[PDB]
Every structure is written in structure tokens, then in C-alpha cells.
Amino acid sequence: EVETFAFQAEIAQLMSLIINTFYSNKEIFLRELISNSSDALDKIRYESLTDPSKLDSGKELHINLIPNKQDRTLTIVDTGIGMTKADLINNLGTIAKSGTKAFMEALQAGADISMIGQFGVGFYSAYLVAEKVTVITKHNDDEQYAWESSAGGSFTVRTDTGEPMGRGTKVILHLKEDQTEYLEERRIKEIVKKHSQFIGYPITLFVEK
Ligand SMILES: OCCNC(=S)N[C@H]1C[C@@H]2C=C[C@H]1C2
């Protein structure tokens, strides 16, 4: 059972701007997704202080970076708080509407795309490098879901039947054909050191077989 939804017009506009604007400094997508993962980890860690059972779905708080040249995917996995179905369809998009508007006005006043994270919508910088993004997520209070969008104004949500996650979020970047440098170990290492050196959780960069 796959459900198809229309993006809010403002988010579709943000996605088109990210996809169509000429802007060479694409590597910042990784900082924005790692920052999102760090925030999700902060949330479950804080909530576990008053309800330790919230970690029954997994004690480890970490971030894994998994490149796969065969599938041409870069996967960012965290064991954070995860997202509910309502998060995927309604809640986060509602919040992102005001952040998108502020970001759009800032860009017109001279900001650049690298400052997208200051407006809370850094996730969508994934489309600087990905033609399709798949998000697998599991929140303690809900089922495991797959969100997916290739832009163009629509996204899908389905119950995920694959390997159970325990808790957290997996962002699968199906990279554009000319963006495969983000599958190279030395390139990912360089970006993490430059932009994500002080993240307060272990970041493991997987090596390819
Ligand atoms: O996870 C926090 C960042 N997410 C944002 S800003 N927006 C939503 C769009 C995609 C589906 C749910 C999330 C990712």
C-alpha cells in the first residue's frame, strides 16, 4: 500500500530552487544530514533520561556513513528518535514552510545555499547531489516507514517491509550520475573533517567491499 502525496507548494519551490540553481559548493549536503542525525540523537538521549525504556529499541547512539558504488547510493544512518507517519506526511512539512520562506527571502537579500541549515530545512540540500532520496525511519511510537521522493512535486510513504531498524532514521541518497565523488572514502573523510568534526556522536565511515 503506497500512498502518494503532493508537497506543499512552498516546499516544491524550495526543491526546484535546490535542483535548478547553479551552485558548485554541493558538499554541504553531508553536513546538513549529519546535523539532522545529531539533532535526532540529542532528542532520544534527552528523553531517555526520564524514561530509560525509550532505549529498549537500541542503546547505541551513533551515525554510520555507508557508500555503495554498485547501487550508487550514500546512506546516512542514525539511531536517533526517528519519525512518525505524521512527521513524514504533515508535521515536519508544516514547520518547514516558515523556514523555507525565510530562506527564500534571505537568498534574495544575498545569502547563499550553504546557509540552508540556519532555516531548519537543510534536509532538502540532499537534492544537490541525489536524484532520488529514500528515508527509512522508525519511531518508538509508530511503525517502520519508507518515505521517498524524486522531487517533481510529489512524495510517497509506505510501510517498510525490509530489515527492521530498531529505532532511528536511514537517509538513502540515490546519487546523480555526475556526483559519484561522494562515494569515495577520501572525499567523505575530507568533508566530515571540514564540516562535522565536533559532532558529539561516533561517525563510522564504512569501507566498500
Ligand atoms: O528530519 C528532520 C528534517 N526533515 C525535514 S526539514 N522535512 C521532512 C521532509 C522529509 C520527510 C520528512 C522530513 C524529511
PDB file of C-alpha atoms and ligand atoms in Angstrom:
ATOM      1  CA  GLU A   1       0.000   0.000   0.000  1.00  0.00           C
ATOM      2  CA  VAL A   2       1.863   3.040  -1.354  1.00  0.00           C
ATOM      3  CA  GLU A   3       0.370   6.471  -0.687  1.00  0.00           C
ATOM      4  CA  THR A   4       1.300   9.411  -2.918  1.00  0.00           C
ATOM      5  CA  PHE A   5       1.208  12.979  -1.584  1.00  0.00           C
ATOM      6  CA  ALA A   6       1.751  16.433  -3.044  1.00  0.00           C
ATOM      7  CA  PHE A   7       4.407  18.612  -1.473  1.00  0.00           C
ATOM      8  CA  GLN A   8       3.227  21.932  -0.168  1.00  0.00           C
ATOM      9  CA  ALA A   9       3.789  24.408  -2.994  1.00  0.00           C
ATOM     10  CA  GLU A  10       6.455  26.227  -0.951  1.00  0.00           C
ATOM     11  CA  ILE A  11       8.469  23.028  -0.400  1.00  0.00           C
ATOM     12  CA  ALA A  12       8.156  22.053  -4.063  1.00  0.00           C
ATOM     13  CA  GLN A  13       9.504  25.523  -4.870  1.00  0.00           C
ATOM     14  CA  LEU A  14      12.422  25.045  -2.458  1.00  0.00           C
ATOM     15  CA  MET A  15      13.214  21.690  -4.068  1.00  0.00           C
ATOM     16  CA  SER A  16      13.143  23.213  -7.562  1.00  0.00           C
ATOM     17  CA  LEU A  17      15.490  26.001  -6.449  1.00  0.00           C
ATOM     18  CA  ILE A  18      17.955  23.492  -4.975  1.00  0.00           C
ATOM     19  CA  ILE A  19      17.827  21.387  -8.143  1.00  0.00           C
ATOM     20  CA  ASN A  20      17.998  24.191 -10.724  1.00  0.00           C
ATOM     21  CA  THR A  21      20.203  26.910  -9.186  1.00  0.00           C
ATOM     22  CA  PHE A  22      23.820  26.936 -10.331  1.00  0.00           C
ATOM     23  CA  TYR A  23      25.853  26.375  -7.156  1.00  0.00           C
ATOM     24  CA  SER A  24      29.128  24.450  -7.050  1.00  0.00           C
ATOM     25  CA  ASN A  25      29.507  24.026  -3.258  1.00  0.00           C
ATOM     26  CA  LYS A  26      27.359  20.888  -3.164  1.00  0.00           C
ATOM     27  CA  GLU A  27      29.374  19.062  -0.477  1.00  0.00           C
ATOM     28  CA  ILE A  28      27.476  20.845   2.313  1.00  0.00           C
ATOM     29  CA  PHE A  29      24.598  18.359   1.923  1.00  0.00           C
ATOM     30  CA  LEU A  30      26.519  15.934   4.138  1.00  0.00           C
ATOM     31  CA  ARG A  31      26.936  18.422   6.988  1.00  0.00           C
ATOM     32  CA  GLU A  32      23.194  19.125   6.891  1.00  0.00           C
ATOM     33  CA  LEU A  33      22.208  15.453   7.081  1.00  0.00           C
ATOM     34  CA  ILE A  34      24.769  14.719   9.803  1.00  0.00           C
ATOM     35  CA  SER A  35      23.427  17.731  11.709  1.00  0.00           C
ATOM     36  CA  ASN A  36      19.894  16.335  11.359  1.00  0.00           C
ATOM     37  CA  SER A  37      21.111  12.985  12.693  1.00  0.00           C
ATOM     38  CA  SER A  38      22.874  14.666  15.615  1.00  0.00           C
ATOM     39  CA  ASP A  39      19.648  16.509  16.492  1.00  0.00           C
ATOM     40  CA  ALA A  40      17.652  13.266  16.369  1.00  0.00           C
ATOM     41  CA  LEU A  41      20.221  11.611  18.635  1.00  0.00           C
ATOM     42  CA  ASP A  42      20.085  14.534  21.095  1.00  0.00           C
ATOM     43  CA  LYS A  43      16.302  14.103  21.287  1.00  0.00           C
ATOM     44  CA  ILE A  44      16.245  10.398  22.142  1.00  0.00           C
ATOM     45  CA  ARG A  45      19.152  10.844  24.554  1.00  0.00           C
ATOM     46  CA  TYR A  46      17.307  13.603  26.438  1.00  0.00           C
ATOM     47  CA  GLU A  47      14.018  11.696  26.507  1.00  0.00           C
ATOM     48  CA  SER A  48      15.775   8.571  27.808  1.00  0.00           C
ATOM     49  CA  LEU A  49      16.891  10.494  30.919  1.00  0.00           C
ATOM     50  CA  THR A  50      13.325  10.411  32.262  1.00  0.00           C
ATOM     51  CA  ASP A  51      12.172   7.189  30.559  1.00  0.00           C
ATOM     52  CA  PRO A  52      15.061   4.725  30.132  1.00  0.00           C
ATOM     53  CA  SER A  53      12.687   2.267  28.439  1.00  0.00           C
ATOM     54  CA  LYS A  54      12.835   4.515  25.354  1.00  0.00           C
ATOM     55  CA  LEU A  55      16.221   2.870  24.671  1.00  0.00           C
ATOM     56  CA  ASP A  56      14.761  -0.649  24.709  1.00  0.00           C
ATOM     57  CA  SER A  57      14.810  -0.293  20.896  1.00  0.00           C
ATOM     58  CA  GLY A  58      18.603   0.210  20.966  1.00  0.00           C
ATOM     59  CA  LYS A  59      21.121   1.688  23.420  1.00  0.00           C
ATOM     60  CA  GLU A  60      23.793   2.747  20.928  1.00  0.00           C
ATOM     61  CA  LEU A  61      23.687   6.383  19.766  1.00  0.00           C
ATOM     62  CA  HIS A  62      25.730   6.700  16.593  1.00  0.00           C
ATOM     63  CA  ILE A  63      25.910   7.739  12.938  1.00  0.00           C
ATOM     64  CA  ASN A  64      27.037   5.457  10.102  1.00  0.00           C
ATOM     65  CA  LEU A  65      28.036   6.607   6.607  1.00  0.00           C
ATOM     66  CA  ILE A  66      27.637   3.812   4.067  1.00  0.00           C
ATOM     67  CA  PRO A  67      28.678   4.292   0.416  1.00  0.00           C
ATOM     68  CA  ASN A  68      27.722   1.661  -2.154  1.00  0.00           C
ATOM     69  CA  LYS A  69      29.178   2.106  -5.647  1.00  0.00           C
ATOM     70  CA  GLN A  70      27.190  -0.855  -7.005  1.00  0.00           C
ATOM     71  CA  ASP A  71      23.863   0.818  -6.134  1.00  0.00           C
ATOM     72  CA  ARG A  72      25.367   4.331  -6.423  1.00  0.00           C
ATOM     73  CA  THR A  73      23.965   5.215  -3.004  1.00  0.00           C
ATOM     74  CA  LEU A  74      25.308   7.083   0.001  1.00  0.00           C
ATOM     75  CA  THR A  75      23.376   6.137   3.141  1.00  0.00           C
ATOM     76  CA  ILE A  76      23.361   8.184   6.352  1.00  0.00           C
ATOM     77  CA  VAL A  77      22.120   6.056   9.269  1.00  0.00           C
ATOM     78  CA  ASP A  78      21.470   7.262  12.797  1.00  0.00           C
ATOM     79  CA  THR A  79      19.901   5.653  15.849  1.00  0.00           C
ATOM     80  CA  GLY A  80      18.083   8.833  16.869  1.00  0.00           C
ATOM     81  CA  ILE A  81      14.472   9.327  17.878  1.00  0.00           C
ATOM     82  CA  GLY A  82      13.104   8.530  14.395  1.00  0.00           C
ATOM     83  CA  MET A  83       9.967   9.948  12.782  1.00  0.00           C
ATOM     84  CA  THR A  84       6.287   9.043  12.950  1.00  0.00           C
ATOM     85  CA  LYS A  85       3.975   8.732   9.976  1.00  0.00           C
ATOM     86  CA  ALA A  86       2.530  12.125  10.971  1.00  0.00           C
ATOM     87  CA  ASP A  87       6.073  13.552  10.957  1.00  0.00           C
ATOM     88  CA  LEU A  88       6.654  12.297   7.412  1.00  0.00           C
ATOM     89  CA  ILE A  89       3.327  13.450   5.937  1.00  0.00           C
ATOM     90  CA  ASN A  90       2.311  16.558   7.931  1.00  0.00           C
ATOM     91  CA  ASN A  91       4.306  17.723  10.904  1.00  0.00           C
ATOM     92  CA  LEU A  92       7.788  18.421   9.560  1.00  0.00           C
ATOM     93  CA  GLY A  93       6.468  19.915   6.331  1.00  0.00           C
ATOM     94  CA  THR A  94       4.349  22.329   8.354  1.00  0.00           C
ATOM     95  CA  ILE A  95       7.432  23.509  10.252  1.00  0.00           C
ATOM     96  CA  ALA A  96       9.487  23.681   7.058  1.00  0.00           C
ATOM     97  CA  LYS A  97       7.038  26.128   5.432  1.00  0.00           C
ATOM     98  CA  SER A  98       8.181  29.085   7.536  1.00  0.00           C
ATOM     99  CA  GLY A  99      11.830  28.069   7.325  1.00  0.00           C
ATOM    100  CA  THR A 100      11.557  27.827   3.545  1.00  0.00           C
ATOM    101  CA  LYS A 101      10.016  31.289   3.301  1.00  0.00           C
ATOM    102  CA  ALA A 102      12.747  32.801   5.493  1.00  0.00           C
ATOM    103  CA  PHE A 103      15.455  31.008   3.489  1.00  0.00           C
ATOM    104  CA  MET A 104      13.960  32.268   0.212  1.00  0.00           C
ATOM    105  CA  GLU A 105      13.921  35.879   1.418  1.00  0.00           C
ATOM    106  CA  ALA A 106      17.494  35.532   2.710  1.00  0.00           C
ATOM    107  CA  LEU A 107      18.692  34.222  -0.661  1.00  0.00           C
ATOM    108  CA  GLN A 108      17.140  37.247  -2.366  1.00  0.00           C
ATOM    109  CA  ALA A 109      18.927  39.510   0.143  1.00  0.00           C
ATOM    110  CA  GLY A 110      22.312  37.933  -0.639  1.00  0.00           C
ATOM    111  CA  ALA A 111      22.572  34.690   1.342  1.00  0.00           C
ATOM    112  CA  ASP A 112      23.716  31.501  -0.375  1.00  0.00           C
ATOM    113  CA  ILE A 113      22.514  27.910  -0.427  1.00  0.00           C
ATOM    114  CA  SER A 114      25.159  26.824   2.108  1.00  0.00           C
ATOM    115  CA  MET A 115      23.257  28.658   4.867  1.00  0.00           C
ATOM    116  CA  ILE A 116      20.146  26.481   4.359  1.00  0.00           C
ATOM    117  CA  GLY A 117      20.634  24.863   7.782  1.00  0.00           C
ATOM    118  CA  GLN A 118      20.104  28.141   9.634  1.00  0.00           C
ATOM    119  CA  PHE A 119      16.484  27.955   8.446  1.00  0.00           C
ATOM    120  CA  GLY A 120      15.799  24.378   9.560  1.00  0.00           C
ATOM    121  CA  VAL A 121      15.300  22.933   6.072  1.00  0.00           C
ATOM    122  CA  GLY A 122      18.794  21.528   5.479  1.00  0.00           C
ATOM    123  CA  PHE A 123      17.394  18.068   4.693  1.00  0.00           C
ATOM    124  CA  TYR A 124      16.383  19.249   1.227  1.00  0.00           C
ATOM    125  CA  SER A 125      20.020  20.014   0.368  1.00  0.00           C
ATOM    126  CA  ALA A 126      20.141  16.261  -0.272  1.00  0.00           C
ATOM    127  CA  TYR A 127      18.826  17.135  -3.742  1.00  0.00           C
ATOM    128  CA  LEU A 128      22.057  18.957  -4.519  1.00  0.00           C
ATOM    129  CA  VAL A 129      23.554  15.508  -5.130  1.00  0.00           C
ATOM    130  CA  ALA A 130      20.677  12.993  -5.254  1.00  0.00           C
ATOM    131  CA  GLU A 131      18.130  12.389  -7.995  1.00  0.00           C
ATOM    132  CA  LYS A 132      16.040  10.392  -5.512  1.00  0.00           C
ATOM    133  CA  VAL A 133      16.036  10.251  -1.717  1.00  0.00           C
ATOM    134  CA  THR A 134      14.605   7.355   0.297  1.00  0.00           C
ATOM    135  CA  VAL A 135      14.115   7.780   4.049  1.00  0.00           C
ATOM    136  CA  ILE A 136      13.557   4.703   6.221  1.00  0.00           C
ATOM    137  CA  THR A 137      12.561   5.609   9.749  1.00  0.00           C
ATOM    138  CA  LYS A 138      11.308   4.019  12.959  1.00  0.00           C
ATOM    139  CA  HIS A 139       9.989   5.947  15.967  1.00  0.00           C
ATOM    140  CA  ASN A 140       9.271   4.148  19.249  1.00  0.00           C
ATOM    141  CA  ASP A 141       5.599   5.169  18.994  1.00  0.00           C
ATOM    142  CA  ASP A 142       4.949   4.120  15.374  1.00  0.00           C
ATOM    143  CA  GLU A 143       5.754   1.571  12.668  1.00  0.00           C
ATOM    144  CA  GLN A 144       8.713   1.468  10.285  1.00  0.00           C
ATOM    145  CA  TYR A 145       8.069   3.620   7.211  1.00  0.00           C
ATOM    146  CA  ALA A 146       9.702   4.384   3.871  1.00  0.00           C
ATOM    147  CA  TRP A 147       9.425   7.950   2.556  1.00  0.00           C
ATOM    148  CA  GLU A 148      10.639   8.599  -0.978  1.00  0.00           C
ATOM    149  CA  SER A 149      10.757  11.447  -3.447  1.00  0.00           C
ATOM    150  CA  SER A 150      12.383  12.223  -6.774  1.00  0.00           C
ATOM    151  CA  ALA A 151      11.026  15.796  -6.497  1.00  0.00           C
ATOM    152  CA  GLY A 152       8.645  16.901  -9.223  1.00  0.00           C
ATOM    153  CA  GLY A 153       6.071  17.897  -6.619  1.00  0.00           C
ATOM    154  CA  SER A 154       5.176  14.569  -5.016  1.00  0.00           C
ATOM    155  CA  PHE A 155       6.413  12.079  -2.458  1.00  0.00           C
ATOM    156  CA  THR A 156       5.329   8.626  -1.321  1.00  0.00           C
ATOM    157  CA  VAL A 157       5.000   6.922   2.062  1.00  0.00           C
ATOM    158  CA  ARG A 158       4.647   3.179   2.626  1.00  0.00           C
ATOM    159  CA  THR A 159       5.043   0.741   5.469  1.00  0.00           C
ATOM    160  CA  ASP A 160       8.563  -0.651   5.165  1.00  0.00           C
ATOM    161  CA  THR A 161       8.935  -4.432   4.927  1.00  0.00           C
ATOM    162  CA  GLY A 162      12.757  -4.569   4.782  1.00  0.00           C
ATOM    163  CA  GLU A 163      15.263  -5.274   7.575  1.00  0.00           C
ATOM    164  CA  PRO A 164      13.828  -3.898  10.854  1.00  0.00           C
ATOM    165  CA  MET A 165      15.747  -0.880  12.135  1.00  0.00           C
ATOM    166  CA  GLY A 166      15.052  -0.898  15.877  1.00  0.00           C
ATOM    167  CA  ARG A 167      14.902   2.900  16.071  1.00  0.00           C
ATOM    168  CA  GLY A 168      16.229   5.806  14.057  1.00  0.00           C
ATOM    169  CA  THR A 169      16.473   7.083  10.514  1.00  0.00           C
ATOM    170  CA  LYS A 170      18.202   5.959   7.322  1.00  0.00           C
ATOM    171  CA  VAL A 171      18.610   8.525   4.522  1.00  0.00           C
ATOM    172  CA  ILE A 172      19.456   6.802   1.221  1.00  0.00           C
ATOM    173  CA  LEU A 173      20.833   9.200  -1.389  1.00  0.00           C
ATOM    174  CA  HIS A 174      20.487   7.830  -4.918  1.00  0.00           C
ATOM    175  CA  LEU A 175      23.255   9.985  -6.334  1.00  0.00           C
ATOM    176  CA  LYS A 176      23.184  11.868  -9.616  1.00  0.00           C
ATOM    177  CA  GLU A 177      25.465  10.355 -12.249  1.00  0.00           C
ATOM    178  CA  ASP A 178      27.982  13.225 -12.038  1.00  0.00           C
ATOM    179  CA  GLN A 179      28.081  13.233  -8.199  1.00  0.00           C
ATOM    180  CA  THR A 180      29.810   9.899  -7.553  1.00  0.00           C
ATOM    181  CA  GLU A 181      32.740  11.625  -5.832  1.00  0.00           C
ATOM    182  CA  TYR A 182      30.634  11.387  -2.652  1.00  0.00           C
ATOM    183  CA  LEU A 183      31.115   7.611  -2.702  1.00  0.00           C
ATOM    184  CA  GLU A 184      34.913   7.932  -2.383  1.00  0.00           C
ATOM    185  CA  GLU A 185      36.357   7.331   1.082  1.00  0.00           C
ATOM    186  CA  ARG A 186      38.914  10.143   0.875  1.00  0.00           C
ATOM    187  CA  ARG A 187      36.238  12.608  -0.263  1.00  0.00           C
ATOM    188  CA  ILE A 188      33.801  11.713   2.519  1.00  0.00           C
ATOM    189  CA  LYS A 189      36.613  11.839   5.098  1.00  0.00           C
ATOM    190  CA  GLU A 190      37.585  15.299   3.843  1.00  0.00           C
ATOM    191  CA  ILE A 191      34.014  16.608   4.106  1.00  0.00           C
ATOM    192  CA  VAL A 192      33.384  15.182   7.583  1.00  0.00           C
ATOM    193  CA  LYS A 193      36.640  16.660   8.910  1.00  0.00           C
ATOM    194  CA  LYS A 194      35.882  20.057   7.352  1.00  0.00           C
ATOM    195  CA  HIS A 195      32.224  20.456   8.396  1.00  0.00           C
ATOM    196  CA  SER A 196      31.335  17.846  11.058  1.00  0.00           C
ATOM    197  CA  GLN A 197      34.476  17.472  13.202  1.00  0.00           C
ATOM    198  CA  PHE A 198      32.791  18.226  16.562  1.00  0.00           C
ATOM    199  CA  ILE A 199      29.596  16.177  16.257  1.00  0.00           C
ATOM    200  CA  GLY A 200      29.038  14.606  19.659  1.00  0.00           C
ATOM    201  CA  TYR A 201      28.396  11.054  18.417  1.00  0.00           C
ATOM    202  CA  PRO A 202      30.630   8.437  16.774  1.00  0.00           C
ATOM    203  CA  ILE A 203      30.583   8.727  12.977  1.00  0.00           C
ATOM    204  CA  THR A 204      31.707   5.488  11.314  1.00  0.00           C
ATOM    205  CA  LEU A 205      32.573   5.696   7.624  1.00  0.00           C
ATOM    206  CA  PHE A 206      32.027   2.221   6.196  1.00  0.00           C
ATOM    207  CA  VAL A 207      34.538   0.912   3.656  1.00  0.00           C
ATOM    208  CA  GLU A 208      33.401  -0.696   0.427  1.00  0.00           C
ATOM    209  CA  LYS A 209      33.961  -4.371  -0.224  1.00  0.00           C
TER     210      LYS A 209
HETATM  211  O1  LIG B   1      14.142  15.033   9.796  1.00  0.00           O
HETATM  212  C1  LIG B   1      14.199  16.438  10.008  1.00  0.00           C
HETATM  213  C2  LIG B   1      14.362  17.166   8.698  1.00  0.00           C
HETATM  214  N1  LIG B   1      13.234  16.960   7.802  1.00  0.00           N
HETATM  215  C3  LIG B   1      12.564  17.931   7.179  1.00  0.00           C
HETATM  216  S1  LIG B   1      13.035  19.528   7.378  1.00  0.00           S
HETATM  217  N2  LIG B   1      11.480  17.672   6.399  1.00  0.00           N
HETATM  218  C4  LIG B   1      10.853  16.374   6.162  1.00  0.00           C
HETATM  219  C5  LIG B   1      10.875  16.052   4.641  1.00  0.00           C
HETATM  220  C6  LIG B   1      11.351  14.588   4.574  1.00  0.00           C
HETATM  221  C7  LIG B   1      10.264  13.756   5.200  1.00  0.00           C
HETATM  222  C8  LIG B   1      10.280  14.013   6.485  1.00  0.00           C
HETATM  223  C9  LIG B   1      11.376  15.020   6.746  1.00  0.00           C
HETATM  224  C10 LIG B   1      12.399  14.627   5.672  1.00  0.00           C
END
